[PDB]
Amino acid sequence: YDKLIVRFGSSKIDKELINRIERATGQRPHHFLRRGIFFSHRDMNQVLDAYENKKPFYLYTGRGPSSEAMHVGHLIPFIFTKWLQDVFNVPLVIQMTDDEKYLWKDLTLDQAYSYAVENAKDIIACGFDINKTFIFSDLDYMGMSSGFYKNVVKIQKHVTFNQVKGIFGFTDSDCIGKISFPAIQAAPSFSNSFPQIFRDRTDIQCLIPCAIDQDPYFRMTRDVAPRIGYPKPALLHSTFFPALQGAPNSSIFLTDTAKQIKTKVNKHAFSGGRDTIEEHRQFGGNCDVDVSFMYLTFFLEDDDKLEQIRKDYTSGAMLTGELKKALIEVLQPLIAEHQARRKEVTDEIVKEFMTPRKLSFDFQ
Amino acid sequence: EDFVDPWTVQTSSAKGIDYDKLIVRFGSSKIDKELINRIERATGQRPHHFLRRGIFFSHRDMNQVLDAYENKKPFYLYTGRGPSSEAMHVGHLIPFIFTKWLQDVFNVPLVIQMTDDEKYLWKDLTLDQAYSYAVENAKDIIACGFDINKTFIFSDLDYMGMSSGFYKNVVKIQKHVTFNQVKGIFGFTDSDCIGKISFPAIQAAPSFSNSFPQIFRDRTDIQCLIPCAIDQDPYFRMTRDVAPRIGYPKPALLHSTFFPALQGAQTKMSASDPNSSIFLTDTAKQIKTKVNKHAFSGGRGGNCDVDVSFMYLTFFLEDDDKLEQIRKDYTSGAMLTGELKKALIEVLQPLIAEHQARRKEVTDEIVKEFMTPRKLSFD
């Protein structure tokens, strides 16, 4: 990961920049920062500069509404974005790319759109404030903005096929909606794409939380920005979420019960311990390629108890199955609590989050 | 004829584009002697001259528009205009006044797409400028006399961002046209901006009732009829291919020949104009100056098949017998060029003068109304 930074030319967060946040925030850096889940960035300093100089900034993230079974991995950006929203108290804009799924998959426009509404339930279950978050459907919001399509057009002019052909790999057997889709993903990065929220303001920086594997796709947007008179969108990159069986039982869905969660991490997670304990008691603990532990890295909020689990699993004291039932006690209460929060999401709360509204934000 | 596209029209021949051949290549159908009567019977009106003199000579499924009009099932008219700049020419009047004619004789709603996004992409303009031209060009279009309770005129940049139905159709059409197909119709290249690669779906979209929920109450099946010069047909031949794939009725069409450029019937009157157009902004003096000096004569006698003045006469005189008398006469030698041009100047001068007058009457508030999404009158 330290070599993917140099590869994409991004800036690495320290344990010193993390402090800069704490000074304006007034909290304790989220464990993603503390642990390095979210390690890289691009222009966080620029966003920070305006936060103290008493100027707003906003967040943006999206979601590809392809059915659901949003697994626990998919929670990583949202958990972090939610945090960002609360410590800075700024607006967030969440995009549901229904057109995209329609273009790429065997769905009807309605089918893609219903998935967008449903996924929006799961997202709201994460707890986003309703007074500073706007979840929008591409298909819906294009028809309801006096600023969105215009920005999409500006981008479409300043980007050629050859450009989108290298970055995304589009060939020419593809449909045109695809070739031009990258402009729809980019448009949300610029404030005046949301008139009911921001107005015709253009000086509001945009912070985009996402992976590190994504930087090459967001550079297109960052490169077009100067060219159209708009500031670049800042970035905060994260690491990947270990695929369960190894880096259908392949992932752990938020719709999974409690026993399924139990039987998955027990029968399908990956082990680093010599596990087939010839005599794992002073060996075993490979906390780099052991999924169960990697997960605790994301979901167990206590550093002290985590380090204890690492010293102990690596040393050989803690066997496998012991570490596993430790994770289960973190997931089961994470997932089940998610499902409950999502039960309380009425058809009217969804419609609200998805309605072009004025928001309550920190101009500061 | 050789080349006819949405951006260029070229022929080696002074007689102009071979229209019976364009019909074979494009796959459209010739407007028969007997299809014209059906228009008469069905509308109880004499067919407009463009129909009688073969100016609008090609169609697609007009028999299906009539199939429905006869049975009391509506249909609507859709046509468009790319505002490349503020000034339009007299060739532009052909599709519009004919559309104004279809509107009255059939009494059906009409939508007119002002493609500001198309020109913002293809040309060097700001979004402000591109919208500006849409507004100005709408005044001239309005000057043709369209019923305000029966016509919707929209800028693409504005209507895309305010319609619960337009973008959705663009997206649907976009899924069914590959870059490969689009570069084999419009000749696009890997160097073109993405906005241009996908632009075709935006022109294809008004071809479906759905993009105007406010007009046809989310009805989805109202038959569409599109009047246009035959250089806009690649867009619509693409559209009719896509329509069934997204469960919509294919749009019908009526193609017109091109109003020749002054120098000859090799190109069409365009706004580039090295010096080839009579702008709807020209003074009586300029119109006369342009006809006498710039309009290719044929003549020196008289060959009607190449005289740019006589071609113009077949578009705006409106007296089949006089035109026919001007034909035999110019051919035989009796008429003698300066008289022929003198005649044409007597028709164009008032035509453009009445246009300007009515245009001066289009107040800002009227442009606004025509361009606001409305219900219309179930026309």
Swiss-Prot record, chain B:
Provenance organism: Homo sapiens (Human)
Protein biosynthesis in keyword set: yes
UniProt induction comment: By IFNG/IFN-gamma.
Gene designation per UniProt: WARS1
Annotated positions of the Phosphoserine modification: 270
SS bond partners: none
Cell compartment(s), UniProt: Cytoplasm
Outcome of substituting residue 365 to D: In a breast cancer sample; somatic mutation
Complexes and interactors: Homodimer. Interacts with an oxidized form of GAPDH. GAPDH stimulates the aminoacylation activity of isoform 2.
Protein name, per record: Tryptophan--tRNA ligase, cytoplasmic
Disorder this protein is connected to according to its UniProt record: Neuronopathy, distal hereditary motor, autosomal dominant 9: A form of distal hereditary motor neuronopathy, a heterogeneous group of neuromuscular disorders caused by selective degeneration of motor neurons in the anterior horn of the spinal cord, without sensory deficit in the posterior horn. The overall clinical picture consists of a classical distal muscular atrophy syndrome in the legs without clinical sensory loss. The disease starts with weakness and wasting of distal muscles of the anterior tibial and peroneal compartments of the legs. Neurodevelopmental disorder with microcephaly and speech delay, with or without brain abnormalities: An autosomal recessive disorder apparent from early infancy and characterized by global developmental delay, delayed or absent walking, impaired intellectual development, poor or absent speech, and postnatal progressive microcephaly. Additional variable features include cortical visual impairment, seizures, hypotonia, spasticity, and sensorineural deafness. Brain anomalies including myelination defects, cortical atrophy, or thin corpus callosum are present in most patients.
Motif 'HIGH' region positions after renumbering to this chain: 83-92
Enzyme Commission designation: 6.1.1.2
Entry keywords, A to Z: Aminoacyl-tRNA synthetase, Angiogenesis, ATP-binding, Cytoplasm, Intellectual disability, Ligase, Neurodegeneration, Neuropathy, Nucleotide-binding, Phosphoprotein, Protein biosynthesis
Segment of the intact protein contained: 82 to 469 of 471
Chief place of localization: cytoplasm
Motif 'KMSKS' region: positions: 268-272
Gene Ontology CC annotation, any one: cytosol
GO biological process: one example: angiogenesis
Lineage: Eukaryota, Metazoa, Chordata, Craniata, Vertebrata
Catalytic reaction(s) noted: tRNA(Trp) + L-tryptophan + ATP = L-tryptophyl-tRNA(Trp) + AMP + diphosphate + H(+)
Domain of life, per lineage: Eukaryota
Role noted for this protein: Catalyzes the attachment of tryptophan to tRNA(Trp) in a two-step reaction: tryptophan is first activated by ATP to form Trp-AMP and then transferred to the acceptor end of the tRNA(Trp).
Modified residues (N6-succinyllysine): 73
Family in the record: Belongs to the class-I aminoacyl-tRNA synthetase family.
